Design a protein around this ligand. Structure first.
Ligand SMILES: COC[C@@H]([C@H](O)[C@H](O)C(=O)NCC[C@H](C)c1nc(/C=C/C[C@@H]2O[C@]3(C[C@@H](O)[C@@H]2C)O[C@H]([C@H](C[C@H](O)[C@H](C)[C@H](O)[C@H](C)/C=C(C)/C(C)=C/C=C/C(C)=C\C#N)OC)[C@H](OP(=O)(O)O)C3(C)C)co1)N(C)C
Ligand SMILES: [Mn+2]
Ligand SMILES: [Mn+2]
Length: 293
């Protein structure tokens, strides 16, 4: 598996017009999936990271925007990265997107991190795009290999014991960090329960406690759930993605939670910007805005 050749080929499309594909050999892609899976399983399901690091929200196959993110934040290993999930579906180039991210994870396993989003699930990416892309450019077996890889992704992370990071949000069933640590991999996402909530919930300013989620699954949570959560676990901030917000990021409950979305002009219809959060050693935050290009 020649990782450097793969990364160089994927980056060659830089400074080009969005849409240009990178056609890697099938065995290479299969290789990235099997190699990265091995690494995912050797690292905790609940990551313990240290700043400085850049945190990114949803990408959704918008490969040319991912390149722009690395451009503004610095290509690995110049900066440590933590992605919050949702690399595939919706966008037209999920393959290049996930391949580049997997290649970086393989080359810099200790300085590059990827969490699971609700779209890194076979039943979801079967509907929203990834499956069609895989079938059109390669074949179904390749999609199945991607599924095996996805089922081994870590679920959450905690930066310097103070910043909790997950894709969707909190769960009424989450009473101890121990619960997340005991989830065994490989695994798929259940239709309810802790694992489901961590990938599917959203914060709601108008709810008291727990509420129904319009996505048709999981719950919504209020500002008080956040405050209580942070306090009992002695954390300072909750960082998540999952929800498209017009400015790329949005603070919730007096800056106790931040939502990050890194795909500008999502689905080609919303006119939202994308954002990336930088956390330094003192844990002070800075946000880079990516205007839709
Ligand atoms: C109420 C106010 C409160 C704050 C609130 N705001 C939210 C979420 C906000 C984002 C909304 O976003 C839109 C547009 C607007 O409405 C919002 C911008 O609405 C969409 C989402 C779609 C849903 O997410 C699901 C894909 C959809 O319901 C599909 C049918 C459900 C499926 C396949 C489900 C359940 C499968 C479960 C499988 C399970 C578990 C296990 C297994 N296997 O509808 C919500 C799109 O959102 P996307 O981010 O792209 O997905 C957007 C079009 C972008 C939750 O509360
Ligand atoms: Mn999501
Ligand atoms: Mn998403």
């Amino acid at each position: 598996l020649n990782i450097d050749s793969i990364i160089q080929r994927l980056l060659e499309v830089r400074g080009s017009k969005p849409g240009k594909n990178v056609q890697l050999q099938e065995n290479e892609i299969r290789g990235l999936c099997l190699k990265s899976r091995e690494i995912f399983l050797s690292q905790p399901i609940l990551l313990e990271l240290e700043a400085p690091l850049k945190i990114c929200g949803d990408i959704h196959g918008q490969y040319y925007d991912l390149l722009r993110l690395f451009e503004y934040g610095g290509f690995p290993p110049e900066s440590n990265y933590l992605f919050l999930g949702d690399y595939v579906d919706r966008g037209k180039q999920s393959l290049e997107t996930i391949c580049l991210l997997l290649a970086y994870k393989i080359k810099y396993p200790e300085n590059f991190f990827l969490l699971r989003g609700n779209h890194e699930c076979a039943s979801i990416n079967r509907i929203y795009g990834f499956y069609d892309e895989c079938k059109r450019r390669y074949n179904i077996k390749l999609w199945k290999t991607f599924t095996d890889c996805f089922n081994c992704l870590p679920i959450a992370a905690i930066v310097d014991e103070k910043i909790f990071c997950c894709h969707g949000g909190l769960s009424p069933d989450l009473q101890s960090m121990e619960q997340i640590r005991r989830i065994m991999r490989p695994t798929d996402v259940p239709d309810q329960g802790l694992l489901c909530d961590l990938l599917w919930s959203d914060p709601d300013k108008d709810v008291l406690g727990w509420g129904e989620n319009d996505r048709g699954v999981s719950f919504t949570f209020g500002a008080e759930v956040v405050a209580k959560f942070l306090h009992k676990h002695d954390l300072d901030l909750i960082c998540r993605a999952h929800q498209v917000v017009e400015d790329g990021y949005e603070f919730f409950a007096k800056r106790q939670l931040v939502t990050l979305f890194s795909a500008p002009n999502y689905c080609g219809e919303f006119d939202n910007a994308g954002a990336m959060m930088s956390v330094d050693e003192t844990l002070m935050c800075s946000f880079q805005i990516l205007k839709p290009a």
